[PDB]
Symmetry: D2
Subunit: 207 residues, 4 copies
């Protein structure tokens, strides 16, 4: 049974880059909904699995097929937002300070500088044509190389792709403050990105 | 735990429209693969579910998300092929005979004729740009109306959509016999379509 | 070269159901974005088509493929919003009044009532897990039957699926006013749906 | 107007890894079909594009949206198969011989060995749940790092993702010889992969 995680900061702590009113809605409404949806979907599948064991019909298999969409969507919603809060921090807790160590080294070697990586990421965020996410990732299958990937809806990066920084591009993540001006939001959010958490994820090679 | 279903006919019973060499591989290899994949996926779900209970972390959620794909794909593969075998039959069991009853009436009212419905379906089949299926369906949400829908890969029709006739458009369904000539396969298969089974599905809405 | 269509109503005309603030942003910003993107994409096609003619390489084919996403997305955004404004109207223009004629008959015959069709549509709207649309459509390929279709992002209904009512489920369509309570928005919008335009679309079959 | 490309080898030249029967059908039927489809779709779009100039209506935009699906699919079909033939060669023409130069250096640095890259690719190919492709690519956006990407149907890798080796995982690519044993096909094809063409693409950073 999953639960809304504790936040490391107060709702209004990322102002002026992200408003407290957005954070409160985003966390108490949107994230809680994925929490509830995920627990419900997992419950429903456990129930369908028990039904399939006694009556392994295509009819019942068809029912399982129907709920896995909810497992994926709500599971992703749960996961992506958890990652999101943990890679945000107020300036007082180091938000917006550049990474150090191995991650900083890989960033410079692959993209030239942190500024270029961020510009690439903002291009990707702007390129999400619908709801979705951009993730700075470490790819474990090609020697641990950095990349920036987009996902849609609540799809997430799995397998060898370890998320280092997740940035939410759903309209609910910025609309009350930025309205249509999503590029202003993408630029502003880096001021409160927690690159210490990114570095920790990079070093661990897991989340 | 699912298994391959009983067939109502022998592998060679659909000759010459669908070769026995195809049916044998199709059932004993391809369908068996979805059976095994689905059973594995459901087992793995059960294991991840216990893991999630012990540690409900994003990491473990991530693992669960990863296997949903296989549940969907192999579950669809299992379900779609079960449908397929049940709506195929040799002529000796009524394959290729036109439907009667309420289904026949609905077909004529909506499409003009069975011939016109079949042509529409062959157009949908030819329009699958990849691996996939066409389904003639009854839509329970809009008053029980017939439609033809395409799916890709092992996606299937769910919700208010009741499959009446499933036709496999994956290349493995025809390649040994027809190779690139998929339209020849789409045309030939209607000689062994079991419309009695479609009519039963239509009447039951299940 | 496309442009924003003229609106038949002032930005604040759909209050209280849809905020004038939302309509103004939705039209002057969001719809404009799609107009700009589509014009840009069609210009690029034109340039790449000429390039491909002179040099029909896989390299240039690859470039042509790369712009198709923009054509589809912005083309969809352009088209869907045009449909949307045309099927909305203030109560003073007859918004929210039930359809009549053939459409009204088809709705009663297939769904039982207008309320049942609306209920089904709201279910499809709530079912969009991401950004998207629901369309009440008339299907030209199954004898002209009504159905409700979900799309994601700016995907739209084409070919035999004729849109009668388009409803936007992107968060920018409701968030300033309803925030997370999208179900409240889906319920409210029917008060300003232009069923007269829906009936016109149904009769024209385009 | 695109045309079927010239092949560098005879239909039967890749036996016994891929039969002459397959190559003949694959090239003269399947590839040709995408050639014809792509030419048709581009002509149709040009036609609608000219109409849209005079009638810039939602109706006409809707018609163009329908056609872009065919441009993408047949365009991809044309492109992927052109890449495919160019990265296959008989053993007499160097097929199956390991890459050298910068490409070989990047492979060992990122994957450990060619064999590890090949195994990863075979895992990706087996993971295509439907029709599709695997590509070994050079990613120009992350400092030119190698990766392996899956696509479905005739989707392809565009922009910063430069295809180095394309491997076809559609059933028509192997069924007549391998039937359901696709893993055997994925394993065998490397014996006739042209790594010299892969190296040229890697060096040029384009196709
Ligand atoms: Mn969010
Ligand atoms: Mn099959
Ligand atoms: Mn909109
Ligand atoms: Mn092929
Ligand atoms: Na509100």
């Amino acid at each position: 049974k999953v639960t809304l995680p504790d936040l490391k900061w107060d709702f209004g702590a990322l102002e002026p880059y992200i408003s407290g009113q957005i954070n409160e809605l985003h966390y108490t409404k949107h994230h809680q909904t994925y929490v509830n949806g995920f627990n419900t979907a997992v419950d429903q599948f456990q129930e369908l699995s028990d039904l399939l064991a006694k009556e392994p019909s295509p009819a019942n298999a068809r029912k399982m097929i129907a709920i896995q969409q909810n497992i994926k969507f709500h599971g992703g919603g749960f996961t992506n937002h958890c990652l999101f809060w943990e890679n945000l921090a107020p300036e007082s807790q180091g938000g917006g300070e550049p990474p150090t160590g191995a991650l900083a080294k890989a960033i410079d070697e692959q993209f030239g500088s942190l500024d270029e990586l961020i510009k690439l990421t903002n291009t990707k965020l702007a390129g999400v044509q619908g709801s979705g996410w951009a993730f700075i990732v470490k790819n474990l299958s090609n020697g641990g190389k950095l990349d920036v990937v987009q996902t849609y809806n609540q799809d997430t990066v799995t397998g060898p792709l370890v998320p280092l920084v997740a940035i939410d591009a759903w309209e609910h993540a910025y609309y009350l403050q930025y309205q249509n001006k999503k590029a202003d939001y993408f630029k502003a959010i880096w001021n409160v990105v927690n690159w210490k958490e990114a570095s920790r994820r990079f070093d661990a090679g897991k989340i």
